[PDB]
């Protein structure tokens, strides 16, 4: 199962949460809850003077860190 595939317990929880957010009815509660599953964040690190993404740990849940 997903355990030896490498994804952690917390990504599994977040995926189950995303599924619960999918199924539930249209209403104010879904409007509050979609915020708690959507992916908007990033990582970044400073070069000598410029910004650069640290894309080794992805935000999307299907993927696996390396």
């Amino acid at each position: 199962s997903w355990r030896d595939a490498g994804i952690s317990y917390l990504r599994y929880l977040s995926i189950v949460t995303r599924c619960i957010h999918e199924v539930q009815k249209e209403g104010p509660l879904l409007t509050k809850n979609v915020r708690f599953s959507t992916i908007g964040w990033k990582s970044l690190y400073l070069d000598h003077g410029a910004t650069k993404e640290y894309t080794a740990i992805p935000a999307e849940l299907e993927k696996i860190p390396e």
Binding site: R3, S8, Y9, L10, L13
Partner: protein, 102 residues
Amino acid sequence: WDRAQIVYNRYHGAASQKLAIFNLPKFEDWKQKLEEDSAGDGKIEEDGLLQSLPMKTALGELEETAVEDFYNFHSCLAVLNAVSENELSEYAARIVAVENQL
């Protein structure tokens, strides 16, 4: 890492946004301290701290992967509370640092 000090801003009130810390141990060290404190009797060594010897036994009843998940889950909740408190502290201190600008 052997210890993670998560710094954040605690919102005590609209005029009070103080500092706060979560000193997270390492997993292997946390497990060893859990065993060493589950063996001996329950005695608090610091005022305001709670005894949790039955918890530190029942977690011994819990399997290994579940204990790792326990650690990661609670550390995640700690980080989340830190982010939420700093969000609110930002939005509360910005008003003060804007009315003085005005």
